[PDB]
Amino acid sequence: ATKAVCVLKGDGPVQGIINFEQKESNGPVKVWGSIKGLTEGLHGFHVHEFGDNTAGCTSAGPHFNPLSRKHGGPKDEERHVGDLGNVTADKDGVADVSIEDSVISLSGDHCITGRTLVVHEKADDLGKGGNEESTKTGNAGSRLACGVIGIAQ
Amino acid sequence: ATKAVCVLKGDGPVQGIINFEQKESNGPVKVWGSIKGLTEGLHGFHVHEFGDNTAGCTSAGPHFNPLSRKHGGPKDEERHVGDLGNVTADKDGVADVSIEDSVISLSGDHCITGRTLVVHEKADDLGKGGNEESTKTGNAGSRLACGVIGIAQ
Ligand SMILES: [Cu+2]
Numbered sequence: 001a002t003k004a005v006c007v008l009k010g011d012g013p014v015q016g017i018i019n020f021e022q023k024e025s026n027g028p029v030k031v032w033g034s035i036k037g038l039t040e041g042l043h044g045f046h047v048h049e050f051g052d053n054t055a056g057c058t059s060a061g062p063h064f065n066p067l068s069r070k071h072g073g074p075k076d077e078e079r080h081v082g083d084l085g086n087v088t089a090d091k092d093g094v095a096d097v098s099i100e101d102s103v104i105s106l107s108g109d110h111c112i113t114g115r116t117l118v119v120h121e122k123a124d125d126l127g128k129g130g131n132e133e134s135t136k137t138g139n140a141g142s143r144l145a146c147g148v149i150g151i152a153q
Numbered sequence: 154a155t156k157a158v159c160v161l162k163g164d165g166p167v168q169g170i171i172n173f174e175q176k177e178s179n180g181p182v183k184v185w186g187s188i189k190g191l192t193e194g195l196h197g198f199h200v201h202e203f204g205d206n207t208a209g210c211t212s213a214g215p216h217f218n219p220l221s222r223k224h225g226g227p228k229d230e231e232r233h234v235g236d237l238g239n240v241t242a243d244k245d246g247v248a249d250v251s252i253e254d255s256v257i258s259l260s261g262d263h264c265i266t267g268r269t270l271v272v273h274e275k276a277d278d279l280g281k282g283g284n285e286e287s288t289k290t291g292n293a294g295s296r297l298a299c300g301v302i303g304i305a306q
């Protein structure tokens with residue numbers, strides 16, 4: 001299997017470790033881990049285009065979107081490659097993440113490795129918000145923590 | 154023109170930003186930027202295999218070595234792909250890095266994106282130290298700072 005990992009950090013208390021595993025190059029990627037320090041509720045979760053943390057999360061650029069589609073949720077046909085939807089934090093501020101996605105990959109010319117994973121302030125509306133910002137970012141607010149997705153053993 | 158970037162951080166004061174540019178695929182990669190907080194003199198500078206910062210720099214693994222060679226300096230045919238030799242810090246503790254290397258790449262099998270750049274405690278002996286450690290790590294000592302190399306624009 002191909003594996004990757006990401007350590008999420010920011011200016012506040014949000015931090016976490018997210019793991020990625022892809023058994024076959026043309027198969028789905030399992031994404032799992034935990035993020036703490038979040039307000040209870042939904043938080044947008046995206047792969048942004050650049051693995052550039054020189055300005056913290058601010059330098060990561062827009063959602064990763066090599067196919068030039070509009071913003072959506074992970075189960076929508078119309079979505080950015082980087083659209084991983086929402087993670088849910090419990091009353092203790094911990095979001096346990098455990099999903100599978102068939103659009104992102106850990107290899108090939110469009111691979112998320114070397115790009116930035118970001119967890120957001122607010123819920124991602126999955127492009128159903130009914131305004132221009134919705135079909136661009138999902139209105140998920142500020143970038144609370146992020147990290148570069150790296151190759152793992 | 155392919156570009157990558159890395160923010161170096163550690164447990165101590167060593168920090169900086171290193172840029173990578175490769176005008177042509179399979180062409181040389183220019184590596185440049187500024188690292189501060191170093192002791193004056195030489196410091197080993199390598200790409201390590203894993204972009205895993207879960208345990209700080211320790212989890213980066215060994216030098217990136219897809220061809221299973223012994224450790225050397227960047228000018229040697231016998232070297233790891235990740236062997237970028239030394240960088241030099243001035244009397245103010247600043248290393249104004251400027252390296253050109255044709256063995257690392259920002260694409261293909263020798264791609265370093267998604268892996269970890271590490272700057273070391275001591276000089277890399279470039280495989281000339283006459284012990285087993287020299288042909289593994291260059292005897293460069295501890296990992297002072299590191300970061301995952303990400304895709305840039
Ligand atoms: Cu995002």
Ligand SMILES: [Cu+2]
Pocket residue numbers: 197198199200201216271273293
């Ligand atoms: Cu090293």
Ligand SMILES: [Zn+2]
Pocket residue numbers: 046063070071072079080082083136137138
């Ligand atoms: Zn999106």
Ligand SMILES: [Zn+2]
Pocket residue numbers: 199216223224225232233235236289290291
């Ligand atoms: Zn080496």
